[PDB]
Ligand binder design. Structure first.
Ligand SMILES: CCCCCCCCCCCCCCC(=O)OC[C@H](COP(=O)(O)OCCN)OC(=O)CCCCCCCCCCCCCC
Ligand SMILES: CCCCCCCCCCCCCCC(=O)OC[C@H](COP(=O)(O)OCCN)OC(=O)CCCCCCCCCCCCCC
Ligand SMILES: CCCCCCCCCCCCCCC(=O)OC[C@H](COP(=O)(O)OCCN)OC(=O)CCCCCCCCCCCCCC
Ligand SMILES: CCCCCCCCCCCCCCC(=O)OC[C@H](COP(=O)(O)OCCN)OC(=O)CCCCCCCCCCCCCC
Ligand SMILES: CC(C)CCC[C@@H](C)[C@H]1CC[C@H]2[C@@H]3CC=C4C[C@@H](OC(=O)CCC(=O)O)CC[C@]4(C)[C@H]3CC[C@]12C
Ligand SMILES: CC(C)CCC[C@@H](C)[C@H]1CC[C@H]2[C@@H]3CC=C4C[C@@H](OC(=O)CCC(=O)O)CC[C@]4(C)[C@H]3CC[C@]12C
Ligand SMILES: CC(C)CCC[C@@H](C)[C@H]1CC[C@H]2[C@@H]3CC=C4C[C@@H](OC(=O)CCC(=O)O)CC[C@]4(C)[C@H]3CC[C@]12C
Ligand SMILES: CC(C)CCC[C@@H](C)[C@H]1CC[C@H]2[C@@H]3CC=C4C[C@@H](OC(=O)CCC(=O)O)CC[C@]4(C)[C@H]3CC[C@]12C
Ligand SMILES: CCCCCCCCCCCCCCCCCCOC[C@@H](O)COP(=O)(O)OCC[N+](C)(C)C
Ligand SMILES: N#Cc1ccc(Cn2ccc(NC(=O)Cc3ccc(C4(C(F)(F)F)CC4)cc3)n2)nc1
Ligand SMILES: CC(=O)N[C@@H]1[C@@H](O)[C@H](O)[C@@H](CO)O[C@H]1O
Ligand SMILES: CC(=O)N[C@@H]1[C@@H](O)[C@H](O)[C@@H](CO)O[C@H]1O
Ligand SMILES: [Ca+2]
Length: 1055
């Protein structure tokens, strides 16, 4: 019965049988319960539920009155309720959702997956300190958000009530809305605010009604069918949660910049730094520590000949592109024959030298043999075996022992990844079925739908990548209810929790006479400090450059002369140093260090700039190239600051251990790049027009007077494929590239939705494989740091007793906690009754804190009380609170000598009372202290991070400073808020690119061709744009990785 293993094996079979029936659910074909197919499936379910009841009875009888056993009971009890409740039509459908817990029974049946889930549950209790930090971020920013922006996103430009009445016309729509509709609302700034969007910015008619929408007042709905707003703490947390995921966070920012103030970016910068970066990466640090505590053939020249023969053949496959000349196609086929014969000859020579049994004795010769026959089969059989010619690159592993040793290391990591993958596939399946029940056939149909198991799994997988997940959120919120946000919050929170544990698992298994004067000047202690001043001043000059400076303005003269002065200063510095040290003769010569070589090249470029500028000559093309090299001057700061020099040298040395993983990843990119070109070249064209459902070919598009256009990210050649693959790997806009590959039909054919669903394998295989390599690169950097780190008064006494006792602290904690609850009840258009109640509560809290200060003064004495920092903090809040009440009362009275701006700030600043709770949080303070101890390392990397922004911010203004956006030339990433028009705006744009939020949209705007009528075009900008964004994205993320490592190592050593 229970003491035999076969009974469990029977239980496992039935558990798997349920998973099949659950996946067969059809949301809008099974809910009506009409089809015979549904009838048998429910019969199947009834059969299985009967066994699950029997299994309990036998086990209950055999053991009598373990978490997993309790789970078995809970599932059946709920199942019995649903099963027995049949007959009552009230909420019967809403009760069938309990069937999705059944696959959880497979956890206990599989031993390995049982042990893993035990560790996951045992690690949870030690995340309480991080969870407490999460509450502080959400509540501090949640309250600040509501008090600032409550009800502002309902603003719309309305018609005047008198205007519509007196003119006796009501055909106009009440408020201005774009032709698109309410999905692109025009949020205006009220009269009592200074938002960036006013009703005077409405475009004119394209018979002048748009100029009569001149009153800005609250509307009826918020953006996205009411999903995005700050009307109460409940909605402010959804906006804060979406920002922390870095998905569509700029859009939320732009809404409040239009409605409230431009300086609201400070709110979203701190939230991303504090909430997105530190608070999410502290989860990884805490788990990481906790988990740790818990005669001719054999010749070298012959081998080299084959090695280069394979390499040329593999690269020759990348010369394919869309419109190949037929002679080029033939050359590739002739080339295939030559290389095919060469490998065939090789097998013959080796077979004779060792014989068939000797030849088979080595696995690699077997692998090489199989390729030859398939390749020969292809020639004799003259598109299925053309794709298999990509396997020829795998032969290079034999000749690359260093790379071969890395491949086995990665493979050994996949033994413990498989355990987590099995848990994640079960995790995805449960949420895919759960979504089908909640949102099945209700997103009326969007491609991101839960209408079937295939696209429910794809949608759930997409949310885990955090790509357009907010689009799915708004659909779920609008269709069923606003509480549907908990489906996505639990899916993301639980999914990222499991993926951190996979990263930690790999880490732990990884741990297991004039010349005399010059010599004196350069050796002077103040030499670097003096030159560092001039370098800093040059930065101010570079940052003032922008395209809108008039050639004849005074500023242009100021900037132009400063260039002559600065170039003169930095040649003298080089000349003085060169004379002192010598150019290259002596051992201490000038060119014996790279940091000196860099300085010389910058000086050389500056001199050439003067020479060219001195030319009244056809040197316009060369001049623009020199302007780009003038933005690298700020690189001279690194050598002058010893802190920067050390960190910069540390990052370079960190790339050595992961050099081979990068090579394997780069080889992977080319292999998949070539494969994509063969599949998708010439098929990413489409017809662009208002009514295109009737078009099916290029010819019909021309007839309908539409335009036949190509996607920005395509696979027309290996150059275009590599750009597309990088956008996939970054997981920003990777769904749109996938859709194009799914819809591809052929050359000159209109793409059709979901034409080839089998292409999901191509795009989802690249995402997983590239993510695996990037996972092992992070582990490679950490392990290296670990290895190198380890190698290296009768009445007064009674009051004094009370203050010393813990009773006062517990009382204070209660008072602040209730003050926390009352601060969350504020919302837009709250009743006046609640206003008075909240105001009265403020009086009680202020009085309590005043008594709190008085008693401590009595107990400890004036100076001794003041010594404690916490006591100082207590005084500030009491003092701060007293002024807030005073300004509130006087303003509420007849006299009005105060600005409603000051009253708002004092109202907002009462959020500081939460800091009194930080005193009780001893565990949280220790967690914060770990970061505070890493500042010397994190501080220097921050300077490198801010230097990286300066160089690319100044380089962006030069390249993309003149791009325009208009209805004639629409743009997808750039807007009124995202531009490179000046250094100040380029800095904000790169911060968005740093977080990866629709950075692929910005790149598109730089790849789109120049107008035939416009001037100041740059013909090869499309070639330079991919380099600009690719390098910044890789470099910006790598620096942040080294910040995470610096904190991680300190937390390990600190224990
Ligand atoms: C650390 C704190 C938690 C962080 C988790 C972040 C994600 C939070 C998302 C949960 C909030 C979802 C509810 C949003 C809300 O309050 O407003 C919706 C609701 C209106 O719903 P209708 O669609 O019917 O609107 C039509 C109106 N006739 O608004 C309300 O009625 C307000 C009731 C709730 C007040 C806000 C407090 C909610 C408590 C949230 C706790 C969630 C914890 C999750 C960890
Ligand atoms: C482990 C993860 C757990 C996540 C599960 C919970 C999150 C999903 C919530 C789904 C239920 C939402 C309501 C479903 C629904 O459709 O309700 C009917 C009604 C209107 O929806 P119509 O589809 O009819 O709209 C179109 C009109 N034909 O929705 C409601 O009014 C729902 C009332 C509120 C239900 C939830 C209350 C929970 C409050 C406390 C939570 C803490
Ligand atoms: C100096 C050169 C350094 C080269 C090696 C860098 C390795 C680390 C890359 C950074 C990384 O893995 O970050 C992933 C990042 C996503 O980051 P989030 O989601 O936390 O938020 C920021 C959003 N971008 O994704 C990227 O941007 C990287 C995509 C490319 C990965 C593949 C690199 C191939 C190299 C050849
Ligand atoms: C990697 C090394 C080389 C092996 C890749 C094999 C891919 C198979 C190509 C065969 C093919 O042409 O079809 C691919 C198929 C598209 O379906 P149809 O051909 O029926 O479409 C009509 C054609 N006009 O899609 C796939 O399944 C290919 C996905 C790529 C495989 C990724 C796994 C690599 C491990
Ligand atoms: C060494 C660096 C880090 C010093 C600090 C950076 C400054 C040089 C930046 C920060 C703010 C920037 C300013 C922000 C806004 C403007 C307004 C704008 O000037 C205009 O002509 C107004 C717009 C218009 O013409 O309609 C663009 C330049 C300027 C002065 C920017 C010039 C460069 C500034 C001063
Ligand atoms: C080779 C690996 C190791 C490194 C990556 C190098 C790539 C960036 C190179 C290799 C092959 C190159 C391609 C070789 C041939 C062509 C065809 C050439 O065709 C045309 O000019 C298009 C004519 C037309 O169809 O109208 C355009 C450049 C392109 C795609 C090249 C772009 C740059 C590529 C992809
Ligand atoms: C390997 C990963 C990390 C990506 C590395 C950066 C690539 C995205 C860069 C490197 C070289 C770039 C290419 C260099 C030259 C050009 C110019 C131009 O080439 C063409 O002529 C193709 C278009 C045509 O057929 O007209 C268009 C962009 C392209 C292919 C670039 C596209 C982006 C590329 C592939
Ligand atoms: C302290 C933390 C753990 C939150 C829980 C405390 C509750 C006592 C507070 C938090 C937010 C408050 C809500 C904030 C906003 C609103 C909306 C307000 O107006 C509406 O019903 C608006 C309906 C809509 O437009 O969706 C009614 C009171 C209510 C539910 C409040 C009731 C009291 C709530 C739930
Ligand atoms: C830490 C990393 C921080 C990076 C992010 C940016 C940091 C601060 C610099 C960026 C913040 O400053 C931007 C301003 O200089 C923009 O000036 P504008 O003249 O364009 O004014 C805005 C547009 N209107 C309102 C005039 C139309
Ligand atoms: N100032 C500033 C600033 C602040 C925040 C932002 C946006 N951002 C948030 C986070 C972030 N990067 C990082 O955490 C660095 C990192 C990248 C990948 C990993 C992985 C995995 F865990 F992901 F798999 C193991 C491979 C770990 C660490 N960037 N941008 C600029
Ligand atoms: C032509 C027209 O409607 N002009 C209106 C005016 O009637 C209105 O009083 C004022 C403030 O709303 O804005 C403007
Ligand atoms: C509704 C209608 O008229 N559809 C026609 C379609 O039948 C025809 O094939 C196409 C191309 O000529 O033009 C359109
Ligand atoms: Ca995105």
């Amino acid at each position: 019965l229970v003491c035999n293993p076969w009974f469990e094996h029977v239980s496992m079979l039935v558990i798997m049988l349920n998973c099949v029936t659950l996946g067969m659910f059809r949301p809008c074909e099974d809910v009506e319960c009409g089809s015979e197919r549904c009838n048998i499936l429910e019969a199947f379910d009834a059969f299985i539920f009967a066994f699950f009841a029997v299994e309990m009875v036998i086990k209950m009888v055999a053991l009598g009155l373990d978490t997993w056993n309790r789970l078995d009971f809970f599932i059946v009890v709920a199942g019995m309720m649903e099963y027995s409740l049949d007959g009552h039509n009230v909420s019967l459908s809403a009760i069938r959702t309990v069937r999705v817990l059944r696959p959880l029974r497979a956890i206990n049946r599989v031993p390995s997956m049982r042990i893993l889930v035990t560790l996951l549950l045992d690690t949870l209790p030690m995340l309480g300190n991080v969870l407490l930090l999460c509450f502080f971020v959400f509540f501090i920013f949640g309250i600040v958000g509501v008090q600032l922006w409550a009800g502002l996103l309902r603003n719309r430009c309305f018609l005047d009530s008198a205007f519509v009445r007196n003119n006796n016309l009501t055909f106009l729509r009440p408020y201005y809305q774009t032709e698109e509709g309410e999905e692109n609302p025009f949020i205006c700034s009220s009269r009592r605010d200074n938002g960036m969007q006013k009703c005077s910015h409405i475009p004119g008619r394209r018979i002048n009604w748009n100029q009569y929408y001149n009153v800005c007042r609250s509307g009826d709905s918020n953006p996205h069918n009411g999903a995005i707003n700050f009307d109460n703490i409940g909605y402010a947390w959804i906006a804060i949660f979406q920002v922390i995921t870095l998905e569509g966070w700029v859009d939320i920012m732009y809404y409040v910049m239009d409605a409230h103030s431009f300086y609201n970016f400070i709110y979203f910068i701190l939230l991303i730094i504090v909430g997105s970066f530190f608070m999410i990466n502290l989860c990884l640090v805490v788990i990481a520590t906790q988990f740790s505590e818990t005669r001719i053939v054999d010749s070298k020249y012959f081998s080299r000949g084959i090695m280069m023969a394979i390499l040329v053949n593999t690269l020759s496959m990348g010369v394919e592109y869309h419109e190949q000349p037929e002679e080029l196609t033939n050359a590739l086929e002739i080339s295939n024959i030559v290389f095919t014969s060469m490998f065939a000859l090789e097998m013959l020579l080796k077979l004779l030298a060792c014989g068939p049994l000797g030849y088979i004795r080595n696995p690699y010769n077997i692998f090489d043999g199989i390729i030859v026959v398939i390749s020969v089969w292809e020639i004799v059989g003259q598109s299925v075996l053309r794709t298999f010619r990509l396997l020829r690159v795998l032969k290079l592993v034999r000749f690359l022992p260093a790379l071969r040793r890395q491949l086995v290391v990665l493979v050994k990591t996949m033994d413990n990844v498989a355990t987590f993958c099995t848990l994640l596939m079960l995790f995805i399946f449960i949420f895919s079925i759960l979504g089908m029940h909640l949102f099945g056939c209700k997103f009326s149909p969007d491609r991101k739908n839960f209408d079937s198991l295939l696209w429910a799994i794809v949608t759930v997988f997409q949310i885990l990548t955090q790509e357009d997940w907010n689009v799915v959120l708004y659909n779920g919120m609008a269709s069923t209810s606003s509480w549907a946000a908990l489906y996505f919050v639990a899916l993301m929170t639980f999914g990222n929790y499991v993926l951190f544990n996979l990263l930690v698992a790999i880490l732990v298994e990884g741990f297991q006479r004039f010349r005399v004067s010059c010599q004196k000047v350069i050796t002077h202690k103040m030499f670097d400090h003096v030159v560092l001043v001039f370098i800093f001043l040059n930065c101010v000059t570079i940052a003032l450059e922008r395209p809108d400076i008039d050639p004849g303005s005074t500023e242009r003269v100021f900037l132009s002369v400063s260039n002559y002065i600065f170039t003169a200063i930095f040649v003298a510095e080089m000349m003085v140093k060169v004379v002192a040290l010598g150019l290259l003769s002596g051992e201490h010569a000038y060119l014996q260090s790279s940091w000196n070589l860099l300085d010389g090249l910058l000086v050389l470029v500056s001199l050439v700039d003067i020479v060219v500028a001195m030319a009244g000559a056809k040197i316009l093309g060369v001049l623009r190239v020199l302007r780009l090299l003038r933005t690298l001057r700020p690189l001279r700061v690194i050598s002058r600051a010893p802190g920067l020099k050390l960190v910069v040298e540390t990052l370079i040395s960190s790339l050595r251990p992961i050099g081979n993983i990068v090579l394997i990843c780069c080889a992977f990119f080319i292999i998949f790049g070539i494969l994509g070109v063969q599949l998708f070249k010439g098929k990413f064209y489409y017809c662009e027009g208002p009514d295109t459902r009737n078009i099916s070919t290029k010819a019909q598009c021309r007839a309908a007077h539409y335009r036949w256009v190509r996607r920005k990210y395509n696979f027309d050649n290996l150059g275009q494929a590599l750009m597309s693959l990088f956008v996939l790997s970054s997981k920003d806009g990777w769904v749109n590239i996938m859709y194009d590959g799914l819809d591809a039909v052929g050359v000159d054919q209109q793409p059709v939705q979901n034409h080839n669903p089998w292409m999901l394998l191509y795009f989802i295989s690249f995402l997983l494989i590239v993510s695996f390599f990037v996972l092992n690169m992070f582990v490679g950097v950490v392990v290296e740091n670990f290895h190198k780190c380890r190698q290296h008064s009768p009445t007064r006494r009674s009051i004094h007793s009370l203050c010393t006792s813990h009773y006062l602290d517990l009382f204070i904690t209660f008072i602040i906690c209730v003050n926390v609850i009352t601060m969350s009840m504020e919302h837009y258009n709250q009743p006046k009754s609640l206003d008075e109640a909240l105001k009265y509560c403020n009086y009680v809290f202020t009085i309590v804190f005043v008594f709190e200060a008085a008693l401590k003064l009595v107990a400890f004495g004036f100076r001794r009380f003041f010594k404690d920092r916490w006591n100082q903090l207590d005084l500030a809040i009491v003092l701060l609170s007293l002024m807030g009440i005073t300004l509130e009362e006087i303003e509420m009275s007849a006299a009005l000598p105060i600005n409603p701006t000051i009253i708002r700030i004092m109202r907002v600043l009462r959020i500081a009372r939460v800091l009194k709770l930080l005193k009780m949080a001893t565990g949280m303070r220790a967690l914060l202290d770990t970061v505070v101890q890493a500042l010397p390392q994190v501080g220097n990397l921050g300077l490198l991070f801010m230097l990286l922004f300066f160089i690319y911010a100044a380089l962006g203004v030069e390249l993309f400073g003149r791009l325009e956006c208009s209805e004639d030339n629409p743009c997808e990433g750039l807007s009124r808020h995202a531009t490179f028009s000046n250094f100040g705006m380029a800095f904000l744009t790169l911060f968005r690119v740093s977080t990866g939020d629709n950075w692929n949209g910005i790149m598109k705007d730089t790849l789109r061709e120049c107008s035939r009528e416009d001037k100041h075009c740059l013909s090869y900008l499309p070639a330079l744009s991919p380099v600009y964004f690719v390098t910044f994205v890789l470099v910006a993320q790598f620096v942040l990785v080294n910040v995470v490592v610096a904190v991680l190592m300190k937390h390990l050593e600190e224990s």
